[PDB]
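Dissemination and training. As part of the outreach component of the grant, students in the summer workshop were shown how a complex can be specified as a set of sequence lines and then modelled as a single object. The example used during the hands-on session is reproduced here so that future cohorts can follow it. Participants entered these lines:
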Amino acid sequence: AWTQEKNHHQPAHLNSSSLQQVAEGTSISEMWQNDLRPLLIERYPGSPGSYSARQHIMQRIQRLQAEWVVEVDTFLSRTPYGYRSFSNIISTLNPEAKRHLVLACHYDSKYFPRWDSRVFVGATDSAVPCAMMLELARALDKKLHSLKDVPDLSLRLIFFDGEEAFHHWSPQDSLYGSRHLAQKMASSPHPPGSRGTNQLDGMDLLVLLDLIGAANPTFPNFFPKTTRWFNRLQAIEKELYELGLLKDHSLERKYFQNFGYGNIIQDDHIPFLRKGVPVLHLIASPFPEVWHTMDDNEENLHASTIDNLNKIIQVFVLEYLHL
Ligand SMILES: *[C@@H]1O[C@H](CO)[C@@H](O[C@@H]2O[C@H](CO)[C@@H](O)[C@H](O)[C@H]2NC(C)=O)[C@H](O)[C@H]1NC(C)=O
Ligand SMILES: [Zn+2]
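and obtained this result:
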């Protein structure tokens, strides 16, 4: 049986001709204004916000001509203030297929106390992620639809709710969603019901994205596990600025750069990675120079980036999936 095939996969590099067509088949002003901004509001749990968002998504997907199958995992937990609810979102093309490329932001904000009209939002941290993840199945829509035949392998999106700790980051004041997804992924098997094959077996990669939207970032590579793939972003990022599908960018300041090895950063990803899942963690390091200050907004953003960085994986994602 499969479960071990996951670790043989290598991609289909396309050519310029194609490489052109969807460096132009993406508009980061379309993203800015349909996907992104109408999330720029306070969207941590309990909040009127944690719905205007959640909901916002849902149709943002399904409105699409491709093939998504959308699930709200929702549950009740221990907040250092009591028993708030939580709502993980789970987009899915080909559910029956049984190995998946998946991308996954945190869809919530930080709670921040209320002493004036000003209020947190989190641009970079992190609606920017989700926003691309949204671009990323718009732009390449029908390419994604073109696969109903129907080996087993497709595309899961995930939006974790409860990235952050209320008062105080801890092993048990944080990640709420993430963890609750693991032993729920783990519990349940697909095939339904292939005995020693649950949901955590078909998770092919996991490219978690956080802190995305500053000028001039740098992403380590943490897990050699998945750096063979990191190599793809070495690779994409050059066969590419060369041909100049890249604005306001040079390769003597690369962000997909290789040295920050086996390092102590703790997102939503840890407990997945801790059923040995191969995970890929991508996250301006050092942190956007405004992280969490009230100043984590539009202002200090930068189209360019997001974008360029929006293409890029809209290749990898392919590649992987033999387009
Ligand atoms: C770029 O790659 C594609 C193949 O992925 C080439 O065009 C395709 O070629 C075959 C014809 O049998 C089919 O896969 C498609 O019908 C073609 N169309 C499209 C739209 O991709 C294309 O010629 C290659 N470009 C080069 C080599 O410059
Ligand atoms: Zn944060």
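Residues 14-15, 17-18 surround ligand 1 (CB under 6 Å). Students were then asked to discuss how this feature might be tested experimentally.
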